Amino acid sequence: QLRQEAEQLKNQIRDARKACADATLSQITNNIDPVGRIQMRTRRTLRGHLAKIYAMHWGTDSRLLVSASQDGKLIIWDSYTTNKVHAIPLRSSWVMTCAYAPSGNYVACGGLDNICSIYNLKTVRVSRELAGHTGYLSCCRFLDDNQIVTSSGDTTCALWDIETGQQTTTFTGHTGDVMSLSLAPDTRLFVSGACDASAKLWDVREGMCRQTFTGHESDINAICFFPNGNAFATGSDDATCRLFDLRADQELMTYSHDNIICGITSVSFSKSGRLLLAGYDDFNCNVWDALKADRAGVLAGHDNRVSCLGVTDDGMAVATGSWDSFLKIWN
Amino acid sequence: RNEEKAQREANKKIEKQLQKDKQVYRATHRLLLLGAGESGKSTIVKQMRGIFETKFQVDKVNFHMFDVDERRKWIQCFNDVTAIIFVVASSSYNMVTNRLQEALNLFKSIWNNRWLRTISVILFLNKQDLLAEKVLAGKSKIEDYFPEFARYTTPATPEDPRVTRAKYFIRDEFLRISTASGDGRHYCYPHFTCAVDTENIRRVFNDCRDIIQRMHLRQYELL
Amino acid sequence: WVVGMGIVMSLIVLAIVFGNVLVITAIAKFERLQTVTNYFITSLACADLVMGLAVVPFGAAHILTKTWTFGNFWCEFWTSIDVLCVTASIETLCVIAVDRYFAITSPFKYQSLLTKNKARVIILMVWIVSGLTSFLPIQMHWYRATHQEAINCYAEETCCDFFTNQAYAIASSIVSFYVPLVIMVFVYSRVFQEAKRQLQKIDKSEGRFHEHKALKTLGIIMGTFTLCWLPFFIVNIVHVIQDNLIRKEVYILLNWIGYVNSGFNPLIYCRSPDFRIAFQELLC
Amino acid sequence: ASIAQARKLVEQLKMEANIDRIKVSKAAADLMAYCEAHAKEDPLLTPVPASENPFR
Ligand SMILES: Nc1nc2c(ncn2[C@@H]2O[C@H](COP(=O)(O)OP(=O)(O)OP(=O)(O)O)[C@@H](O)[C@H]2O)c(=O)[nH]1
Ligand SMILES: CN[C@@H]1CCc2c(ccc(O)c2O)[C@H]1O
């Protein structure tokens, strides 16, 4: 029909993308030496959760962290001494995400209930309850101490205002569910990975989509952002991690193996960006190489699937959360 | 260095609170109420009484029921429930994409889900009186919409042979899917309920007890 | 003959010790096996390991050289440890059976009835009761016989034999074997009845579309224990009721049949797939 | 198609079509330069002494 009339555009853009690629990154990256085998041993273990753990977020001081479980409790830990600091009961027992404010004063958590809640650490009681989404919340990140950006299960993303409790900007354009997002270091652009095997780049100030990527062929579960600010990596259910690029607007490498057929739940980078860490459903975690694609190590020790992952700001340790109700600190 | 003692005291208080909460967490049982639209789920939950939680206690046992659509992805969070309650309209076989065929397709999709390998299903076949009136009144035949009814014969314990065949055919259609790939890890408990019924909660209690007993028997290699 | 006996018996010692240490280390290493049911198995494994590392080799030396080379105090200590381990290795099986009965028959109250604090109390109580009938009657001389051969054997430090009166030979047997038997029989009969009822219900519900495993498991569990420990705790009373009926050689053999029962326990009580996976993770 | 939402897509693809692209060689060189420059300031890749490690 009429729609079919410009379905060609897509073909023209694909041809332009093909013409853009002079050579693969792999060839460019061939001369540099390999990092080699990297051995990491657990240092601390945290106990106290009565159910499976769904999300966690490292603090801005590289000391404290927060976690959420299906028992309906948020616990703020202390990494150095492994002693609990706070324990906040929840009205709703189903939570799917949590976040920690950059200023270190607020914690937010949302779940299957279509509500995003914000707590005040220094006063621990509910400070605000944001409503308006028609689907479950999948991720949320503090843009600042006064405004927060959230992604929901109704194929939309919104930028909220804490003081007024009303939406400011609404992002639309996806077809499937939105599962994860990440913020740029400059806090000006953010990316999201939908359930329709597509990733998009949004502009917070303008409020309009800028670029689109559709390399994957299955559901996208996690997404991370390169430290430089000009690339991002994502992981899908087809056991493949892909590194895209903002300027080139196309894929540069693929991380996959023939001995793994399980899904991918979390993706994270290192301080230097050389190491890419991804958690799988194979009851363990894998450490890749951002450039060469070689595997450089495995992080085993969890009795159930891994559903969280994070790296500290100074990069002194990496934390993993699993459905075994245990948090582990690696180094 | 005096802050360490305060931190230890706070940790002790939090640990005591968590220890207190663990028992009440382990005492309760969770049920997921999943049903297709227009089936009658609201009537059932009202009789029992973006989310709804219901509290009820039977014989000093605390139960906890939850109610919640395409490409269901939130269902992964419900792999630790005791049982799944399914409510389907038995008389909506011609209120057309037959409404029933959608129900059987949904049941087949839920049964074969990877995360629900060890979760049993309690099935309620609602709206029996409408089905009886529809089959008795004529001008509507099960064979017209479901061709397989021609080659079906009564297996049985009657509570009018035609309505008995109508009741049992729908039950067997779900039971076939139930037993196709059960593998002994989870079963299904068919039931024949209506709007005007009493002690539906007793059925749920008995089926939960049966599920727990069967799981415990299988764990010790006795079944 | 001497040559042959020695080697095997060392194989028996190795078989007893290896499985017990393997089970203990596997339970200790992995946190997923820390279950309330696994504490009783840990206690049973510890008791069997102590028995197989303490009483078997000294009895081996005695039966080989036919002369006890140590003092009377070591004889008393050995005879006390024997009774302690034997008595503590059966009440734990009774406790396991009772726990399974409670888990199967009362499914809605199993979580509240048994907790990590109650398991330790029960295990300590069982161990105390086992030790009260093994060291207090033995270190004190209330078990001694009265006839001339008994005191003559008592006087000689180079030989050690077992002489008891009727009172101890009845009380110890009643405490150790006969009481924890009827309880186990009743428990397993009830478990079998429940299994049969559930199987009949399943057959009634979905028979057309679709009792051997339970019978096999109960048969092995009861048969190994009864065959291992039954004849000894009968000849124990018979040799007191009638003196000339039973010779010492039969007594020693029927007693040594019982010691082998400790070796079978890891096979009987650790066939769970989680245990197999944990075993395969190490020692490979 | 006749419905507006399908119709909206055609215009959007456009907006994304008219953007400036660069050769992948420049992007690869920039990524390599960043990784090589910031390679001496990470504890995961380079094992630092246990004295400076707070988790020991
Ligand atoms: N007499 C009788 N009427 C029934 C029965 N079941 C349903 N009904 C009729 O159906 C109506 C109730 O519809 P609901 O249960 O609200 O349907 P619903 O809850 O919207 O269904 P969902 O879309 O699944 O939520 C009542 O007005 C009843 O008259 C029954 O067993 N007997
Ligand atoms: C020398 N071996 C002893 C002899 C008698 C005896 C044993 C174990 C438990 C008892 O209650 C007993 O009376 C045996 O282990």
Instruction: For chain B, report the end-to-end CA distance as a whole number of angstroms.
Output: 60
Interface residue of A71, A81, A92, A112 to substitute, partner B, most B CBs within 10 Å: A112
The SS3 assignment for B72 reads: coil
Atom of ligand 2 nearest to the CA of C162: 1
Q: Which residue of B has its CA nearest to C200?
A: B223
Instruction: For chain D, report the end-to-end CA distance as a whole number of angstroms.
Output: 63
For residues A291 and A265, state if they share a domain. Answer: yes
For residues A304 and A219, state if they share a domain. Answer: yes
Does an H or E element contain B127, and which? none
Q: How far apart are CA C203 and CA C220, in angstroms?
A: 26
Enumerate residues 14 to 53 of chain A having a beta carbon within 8 A of any beta carbon in chain D. Answer: 16, 20-25, 28-29, 32, 35, 38, 40, 43-44
Within a domain: A324: yes
Identify which of B127, B120, B93, B97 has the alpha carbon closest to the alpha carbon of residue B34: B120
Chain centroid, CA B44 distance in Å: 12
Within a domain: A80: yes
Please, which residues bridge with residue A129 across strands?
Answer: A117
Does an H or E element contain C250, and which? helix C248-259
Q: List the strands of the sheet with A115-120, edge to edge.
A: A95-100, A106-111, A115-120, A125-131
Q: How far apart are CA C144 and CA B160, in angstroms?
A: 84
For residues A182 and A330, state if they share a domain. Answer: yes
- Cβ contacts of residue A181 below 8 Å, gap of 6+? A139, A141, A149, A151, A157, A190, A191, A192, A193, A223
Q: How far apart are CA A318 and CA A311, in angstroms?
A: 5
Distances (CA, A) of A270 to A236, A312, B17, B19: 20, 9, 37, 37
When divided into structural domains, chain A yields a total of 2
The answer to whether A50 contacts B14, with C-beta atoms less than 8 Å apart, is: no
Q: Is C217 annotated as a binding residue?
A: no
Work out the angle at residue A269's Cα, subtended by the Cα atoms of residues A266 and A272, and round it to the nearest 5 degrees.
175
The full 3-state SS of chain A, as one line of letters, equals CHHHHCHHHHHHHHHHHHHHCCCCHHHHHCCCCCCCCCCCCEEEEECCCCCCEEEEEECCCCCEEEEEECCCEEEEEECCCCCCCEEEECCCCCEEEEEECCCCCEEEEEECCCEEEEEECCCCEEEEEEECCCCCEEEEEECCCCCEEEEECCCEEEEEECCCCEEEEEEECCCCCEEEEEECCCCCEEEEEECCCCEEEEECCCCCEEEEECCCCCCEEEEEECCCCCEEEEEECCCCEEEEECCCCCCCEEECCCCCCCCEEEEEECCCCCEEEEEECCCCEEEEECCCCCCCEEECCCCCCEEEEEECCCCCCEEEEECCCCEEEEC
Q: How far apart are CA A302 and CA A284, in angstroms?
A: 6
Counting CB pairs under 8 A, whether chains C and D reach 3 or more, is: no
Q: Which stretches of chain B sit within 8 Å of chain A by CB? A: 4, 7-8, 10-11, 14-15, 17-18, 21-22, 25, 50-51, 68, 71, 73-74, 77, 80
Distances (CA, A) of A100 to A59, A105, A190, A268, B124: 6, 8, 17, 17, 44
Domain boundaries, chain D: 3-55
Q: How far apart are CA C271 and CA C273, in angstroms?
A: 6
For strands A125-131 and A137-142, give the pairing.
Answer: unpaired
For residues A205 and A311, state if they share a domain. Answer: yes
H-state helical runs in chain B: 3-27, 41-48, 99-111, 128-137, 142-145, 161-180, 200-219
Interface residue of A18, A156, A272 to substitute, partner D, most D CBs within 10 Å: A272
For residues A155 and A214, state if they share a domain. Answer: no
Interface residue of D3, D12, D44, D48 to substitute, partner A, most A CBs within 10 Å: D44
Asked if residues A279 and A320 have their Cβ atoms less than 8 Å apart, the reply is yes
Q: After which residues is chain C broken (C to N over 2.5 A)?
A: 210
Identify which of B51, B30, B53, B76 has the alpha carbon closest to the alpha carbon of residue A113: B51
For residues A99 and A187, state if they share a domain. Answer: no
Within a domain: A14: no
Token pair belonging to A10: 């897509």
For residues A327 and A179, state if they share a domain. Answer: yes
Question: A125: distance to nearest CA of chain D, Å?
Answer: 32
Method: cryo-EM
Phi, psi of A151 (to 5 degrees): -120, 135
Identify which of B18, A320, A286, A283 has the alpha carbon closest to the alpha carbon of residue C32: A283
Within a domain: A41: no
Distances (CA, A) of B124 to B35, B87, B142, B171: 10, 5, 20, 10
Identify which of A104, A100, A126, A103 has the alpha carbon closest to the alpha carbon of residue A115: A126
Atom of ligand 1 nearest to the CA of B42: 19
Asked if residues A130 and A118 have their Cβ atoms less than 8 Å apart, the reply is yes
Closest residue (by CA) to atom 2 of ligand 2? C82
Token pair belonging to C66: 């036919």
Q: Which domain holds residue A55?
A: 51-172
Q: Tell me, what CATH number does A88's domain have? A: 2.130.10.10
Within a domain: A202: yes
Q: How many B×C Cβ pairs under 8 Å?
A: 53
- Cβ contacts of residue A86 below 8 Å, gap of 6+? A74, A75, A76, A121, A124, B14
Q: Which domain holds residue C28?
A: 2-281
Within a domain: A17: no
Residue indicated by tokens 């959760």: A49
Q: List the strands of the sheet with A264-269, edge to edge.
A: A264-269, A275-280, A285-289, A297-299
* Eight-class DSSP state of D13: H
Resolution for this experimental structure (Å): 3.3
The answer to whether D21 contacts A249, with C-beta atoms less than 8 Å apart, is: yes
Question: Which of residues A155, A172, A189 is at a domain's end?
Answer: A172
DSSP track, B26-44: HH-EEEEEEE-TTSSHHHH
Asked if residues A158 and A152 have their Cβ atoms less than 8 Å apart, the reply is yes
Closest residue (by CA) to atom 8 of ligand 2? C83
Sign of CA dihedral A171, A176, A179, A180: negative
Is D3-55 a domain of CATH 3.40.50.2000? no
* Eight-class DSSP state of C32: G
Identify which of B111, B85, B89 has the alpha carbon closest to the alpha carbon of residue B200: B85
Q: Which amino acid is it at A324? A: D
Token pair belonging to C1: 């003959």
Q: How far apart are CA A85 and CA A72, in angstroms?
A: 17
Counting CB pairs under 8 A, whether chains B and C reach 3 or more, is: yes
For residues A158 and A189, state if they share a domain. Answer: no
Q: Is C172 annotated as a binding residue?
A: yes
Token pair belonging to B153: 């014969």
Please, which residues bridge with residue A56 across strands?
Answer: A67
For residues A187 and A311, state if they share a domain. Answer: yes
Closest residue (by CA) to atom 20 of ligand 1? B38
Q: How far apart are CA B152 and CA A308, in angstroms?
A: 52
For residues A123 and A210, state if they share a domain. Answer: no
Token pair belonging to B46: 């009202």
Distances (CA, A) of C121 to A10, B19, C90, C125, D14: 73, 19, 17, 6, 75
When divided into structural domains, chain C yields a total of 1
Question: Which of residues A172, A202, A237 is at a domain's end?
Answer: A172
For residues A154 and A242, state if they share a domain. Answer: no
Q: Tell me, what CATH number does C243's domain have? A: 1.20.1070.10
Token pair belonging to C283: 């020692």
Token pair belonging to A318: 């990496």
The answer to whether A248 contacts D21, with C-beta atoms less than 8 Å apart, is: yes
Question: B144: distance to nearest CA of chain A, Å?
Answer: 37
